């Protein structure tokens, strides 16, 4: 077992972070793509599922559902209805640039992985959904699809064997909800993006009524590397439930805010300072730390100086780990103002299926406005606590839950600044 883990070189799952040697299928072959994949494909998809569960891939995008269980649900016997694979590539949790880097510098390993996922579960066509903010990177993806087609190696009868597999690209139109699990599916359907109800699973009824699934881009990227490499070489980096490498990125308040691959666990102070410049004003300047992005409660200073960066560790810290915005914020900003702007974002992007997220984000936006102006009573801040207990899990999707959790973290940790703000408003009016 490692002593909390760090980056050892060439154990990077994917190289070519930015602007490296070329941008081509030839460069993909030099970096390790299209190498001996047919012998992996023609062995049987049960062996690929065994390889993935040997690696023990924790599902990405900040959900927690592991890939092995999902794609083992995808082993339904094939009926007259086909099977579909949908590669989701939106970037919610503002602070992200998770797969922007991947789809900007290496679409070829994504092509490898969607071919692997299409073979590994009986899928037949793969729709890749890019965010509508990404026209130029989408056209880079189109150039890469043209190169992979012009090689004559995907499309129809891939790898020389009689196995056709087509991949399409659907743009976004700008949303947070199109990134989610099932509003994606109906946004492809031409109806407006709205999630379905969960106990009919996407692996039973999906895109118009076919057993489909949805994969994150990090899962698609890691998937052919586990096929072409050894079993549990990926699993030797970190703990037993969560295992492998992850993009820990500071998009936020450090000197040189940037992106690094690391292993599953890391000491947080080494992560923040010994890789990405330094904290703006030193280690003792920041007020707090948010991991995850925006669907995660905060972590204060006395907790962030000690807590390691694991999924089980953040379960023990009552939060949820996501991607790429594992950032600090300074005392010089008001965290009430920052979380209130995040609640304004939540109001600006949410569909109107469920009554409780709709009206709860309405109350929380107006009440956080009355907290920034400070025109309330302490019964109001405990009422905000009560409604954040009411909303959570009583919806379809997790946007209501991810609007409940930052209010929870702010109430659990930063009571005294709220009390002093309200006392200063009392001194102002009186």
């Amino acid at each position: 077992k490692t002593s909390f883990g760090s980056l050892k070189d060439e154990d990077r799952i994917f190289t070519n972070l930015y602007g490296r040697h070329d941008w081509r299928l030839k460069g993909a072959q030099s970096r390790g793509d299209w190498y001996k994949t047919k012998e992996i494909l023609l062995k049987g998809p049960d062996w690929i599922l065994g390889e993935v569960k040997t690696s023990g891939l924790r599902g990405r995008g900040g959900a927690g559902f592991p890939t092995g269980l999902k794609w083992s649900f995808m082993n339904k016997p094939s009926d007259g209805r086909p099977k579909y694979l949908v590669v989701n590539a939106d970037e919610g949790e503002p602070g992200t640039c998770k797969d922007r880097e991947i789809i900007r510098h290496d679409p070829h390993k994504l092509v490898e992985g969607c071919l692997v996922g299409g073979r590994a579960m009986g899928a037949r066509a793969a729709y890749i959904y890019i965010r509508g903010e990404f026209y130029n990177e989408a056209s880079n993806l189109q150039v890469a699809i043209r190169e992979a087609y012009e090689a004559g190696l995907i499309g129809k009868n891939a790898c020389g064997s009689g196995y056709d597999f087509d991949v399409f690209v659907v743009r976004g139109a700008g949303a947070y909800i199109c990134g989610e699990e099932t509003a994606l599916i109906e946004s492809i359907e031409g109806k407006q993006g709205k999630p379905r109800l969960k106990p009919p699973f996407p692996a039973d009824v999906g895109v118009f009524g076919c057993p489909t699934t949805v994969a994150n881009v990090e899962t698609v990227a890691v998937s052919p590397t586990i096929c072409r490499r050894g079993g549990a070489w990926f699993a030797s980096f970190g703990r037993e439930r969560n295992s492998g490498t992850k993009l820990f990125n500071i998009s936020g308040h450090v000197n040189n805010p940037c992106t690094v691959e690391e292993e599953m666990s890391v000491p947080l102070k080494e992560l923040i300072e010994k890789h990405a410049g330094g904290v703006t004003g030193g280690w003792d300047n920041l007020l707090a730390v948010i991991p995850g992005g925006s669907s995660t409660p905060l972590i204060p200073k006395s907790v962030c100086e000690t807590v390691l960066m694991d999924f089980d560790a953040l379960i023990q810290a009552q939060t949820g780990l996501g991607t790429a915005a594992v950032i600090v914020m300074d005392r010089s900003t008001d965290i009430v103002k920052a979380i209130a702007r995040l609640i304004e974002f939540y109001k600006h992007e949410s569909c109107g299926q469920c009554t409780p997220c709709r009206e709860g984000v309405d109350w929380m936006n107006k009440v956080m406005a009355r907290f920034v102006r400070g025109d309330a009573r302490p019964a109001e801040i405990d009422s905000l606590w009560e409604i954040s207990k009411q909303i959570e899990g009583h919806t379809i999707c997790a946007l209501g839950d991810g609007a409940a959790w930052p209010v929870q973290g702010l109430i659990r940790h930063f009571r005294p600044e709220l009390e002093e703000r309200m006392q200063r408003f009392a001194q102002q009016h009186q």
Binding site: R81, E186, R196, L197, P200, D204, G209
Partner: protein, 66 residues
């Protein structure tokens, strides 16, 4: 003709007798003498609907809006 009201020569016009079974209703009506018209009870018919059937593939039951 002085206020615009609805007078009536009907003392029995505002009777109602809420009962629990049709048998005791008919028994009381035949016991107290006057005639009676029996209309039969109609429950709502049980149906067969599902959200997955509202998301059909090649069946025409399709929500078309959401």
């Amino acid at each position: 003709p002085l206020m615009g009201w609805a007078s009536t020569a009907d003392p029995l016009s505002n009777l109602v007798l809420t009962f629990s079974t049709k048998e005791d209703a008919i028994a009381f009506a035949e016991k107290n003498g006057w005639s009676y018209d029996v209309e039969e009870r109609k429950v709502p018919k049980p149906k067969s609907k599902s959200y997955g059937a509202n998301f059909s593939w090649n069946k025409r039951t399709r929500v078309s809006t959401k």
